[PDB]
Amino acid sequence: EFQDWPIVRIAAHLPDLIVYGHFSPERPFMDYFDGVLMFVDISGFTAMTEKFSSAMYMDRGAEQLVEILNYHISAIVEKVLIFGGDILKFAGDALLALWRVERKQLKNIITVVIKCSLEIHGLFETQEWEEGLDIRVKIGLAAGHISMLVFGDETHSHFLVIGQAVDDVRLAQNMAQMNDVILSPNCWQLCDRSMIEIESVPDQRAVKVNFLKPPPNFNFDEFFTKCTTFMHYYPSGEHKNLLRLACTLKPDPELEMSLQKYVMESILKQIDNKQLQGYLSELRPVTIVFVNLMFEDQDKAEEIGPAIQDAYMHITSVLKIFQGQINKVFMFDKGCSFLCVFGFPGEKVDELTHALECAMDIFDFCSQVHKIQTVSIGVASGIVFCGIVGHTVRHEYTVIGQKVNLAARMMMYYPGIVTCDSVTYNGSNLPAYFFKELPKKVMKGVADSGPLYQYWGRTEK
Numbered sequence: 001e002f003q004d005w006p007i008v009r010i011a012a013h014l015p016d017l018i019v020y021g022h023f024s025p026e027r028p029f030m031d032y033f034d035g036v037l038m039f040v041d042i043s044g045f046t047a048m049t050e051k052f053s054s055a056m057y058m059d060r061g062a063e064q065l066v067e068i069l070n071y072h073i074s075a076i077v078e079k080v081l082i083f084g085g086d087i088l089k090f091a092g093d094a095l096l097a098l099w100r101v102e103r104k105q106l107k108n109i110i111t112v113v114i115k116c117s118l119e120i121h122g123l124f125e126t127q128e129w130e131e132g133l134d135i136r137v138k139i140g141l142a143a144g145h146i147s148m149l150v151f152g153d154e155t156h157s158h159f160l161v162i163g164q165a166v167d168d169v170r171l172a173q174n175m176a177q178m179n180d181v182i183l184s185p186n187c188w189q190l191c192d193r194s195m196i197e198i199e200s201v202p203d204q205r206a207v208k209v210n211f212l213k214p215p216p217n218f219n220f221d222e223f224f225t226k227c228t229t230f231m232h233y234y235p236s237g238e239h240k241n242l243l244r245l246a247c248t249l250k251p252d253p254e255l256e257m258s259l260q261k262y263v264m265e266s267i268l269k270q271i272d273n274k275q276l277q278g279y280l281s282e283l284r285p286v287t288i289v290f291v292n293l294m295f296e297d298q299d300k301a302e303e304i305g306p307a308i309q310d311a312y313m314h315i316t317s318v319l320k321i322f323q324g325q326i327n328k329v330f331m332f333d334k335g336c337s338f339l340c341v342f343g344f345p346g347e348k349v350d351e352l353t354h355a356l357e358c359a360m361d362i363f364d365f366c367s368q369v370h371k372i373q374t375v376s377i378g379v380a381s382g383i384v385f386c387g388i389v390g391h392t393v394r395h396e397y398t399v400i401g402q403k404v405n406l407a408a409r410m411m412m413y414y415p416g417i418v419t420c421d422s423v424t425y426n427g428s429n430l431p432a433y434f435f436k437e438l439p440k441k442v443m444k445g446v447a448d449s450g451p452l453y454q455y456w457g458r459t460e461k
């Protein structure tokens with residue numbers, strides 16, 4: 001069976017949630033379901049990101065980084081897929097996966113997902129990034145009601161999953177130490193407590209898995225086979241050796257038109273064999289504009305949806321003018337954030353002045369969108385790693401680096417304003433009184449930030 005059609009290559013960049021969705025063209029589009037979520041990332045990775053920027057890598061740092069990252073993350077991906085999970089999105093060295101199931105099957109699926117989690121940790125027992133540095137992962141699990149949001153215009157589409165289970169998995173995974181599997185409170189509440197031995201996490205209702213101790217007669221393979229009854233797209237029969245059913249997709253121009261809207265044009269160029277397959281793995285100077293949209297505690301998905309949509313419509317128009325791309329969209333703890341990048345495949349130009357002007361335009365517009373409580377934007381400029389991360393069958397373009405993290409922390413630690421780093425401030429074709437030098441905050445994962453500035457804008461008022 002020939003499988004290497006463009007439609008199949010596009011499907012590598014998307015979950016089954018999207019590939020096999022069959023939803024309307026209205027934007028926003030929302031749907032509601034239940035599932036179990038897994039959030040996982042890799043320890044010692046930042047350490048490596050640093051190693052690969054240095055001269056010892058002889059101009060092949062981005063190539064070597066992408067290789068070693070994909071070596072590890074593709075193993076995680078394969079575990080997830082063989083356990084029946086759907087990888088939703090990647091961000092750097094992190095990924096979110098979903099096992100969508102009927103409410104009645106949540107108990108047994110939690111068991112599957114815990115076993116998957118333990119098998120993931122098992123890959124990394126004894127593993128080192130390099131001699132002297134271990135590679136381990138941290139896992140959070142959650143379960144419950146999940147909403148999906150699809151937003152976009154006639155040319156581009158984005159999706160998010162939303163709700164308390166989504167917030168829960170992020171919180172769980174944040175409490176995890178290397179080697180941990182943390183369960184959300186609701187996940188512990190819904191699980192097969194007869195089989196899962198936990199310990200309390202101090203000052204938290206979330207719990208830590210110590211062991212899976214199944215009954216004497218339990219057989220995991222048989223249990224798993226029964227669970228597959230409820231997995232609509234588990235590869236089976238003649239396709240039992242495939243990691244994904246999506247590998248069997250056949251040409252279908254209406255489906256392909258829908259799916260391509262989720263994928264960046266430079267990626268589609270590679271997929272169409274009009275660009276070299278290695279061209280997107282690079283350490284390149286970019287400017288990151290990280291936009292955070294905060295909603296109220298009580299806001300439901302049905303009001304968040306339209307507001308994201310409205311914000312998006314303006315974001316995309318401004319980025320187009322200023323030559324920027326949306327690299328990734330995230331949502332947790334009532335903040336929807338857009339990781340925007342100026343300068344990447346082909347787009348290099350007063351990149352700084354424009355990133356700042358774009359940020360102010362976004363800030364001013366979004367601040368007026370109904371339901372958006374606070375807009376915050378962090379702007380940082382520097383060398384970042386760009387590349388397609390994941391497995392051959394399930395991968396995405398992503399950006400990794402200290403300036404990405406810096407922009408992300410700025411937007412959270414300095415809410416309600418537009419902030420920029422020192423590179424941006426100094427490089428800009430703009431006068432000093434357009435800025436305000438800020439108090440320096442101690443920020444998680446942040447270096448010495450260097451001086452940080454608010455972009456005040458062109459007038460006092």
Ligand SMILES: Nc1nc(Cl)cc(N(Cc2cccs2)C2CC2)n1
Nearest residue numbers: 088089091096160161170330331332
């Ligand atoms: N809300 C949301 N949706 C998706 Cl599909 C992904 C995503 N993020 C951020 C989150 C991580 C954990 C819970 S939400 C993944 C890509 C890092 N956030």
Ligand SMILES: [Cl-]
Nearest residue numbers: 049401402403
């Ligand atoms: Cl870096």
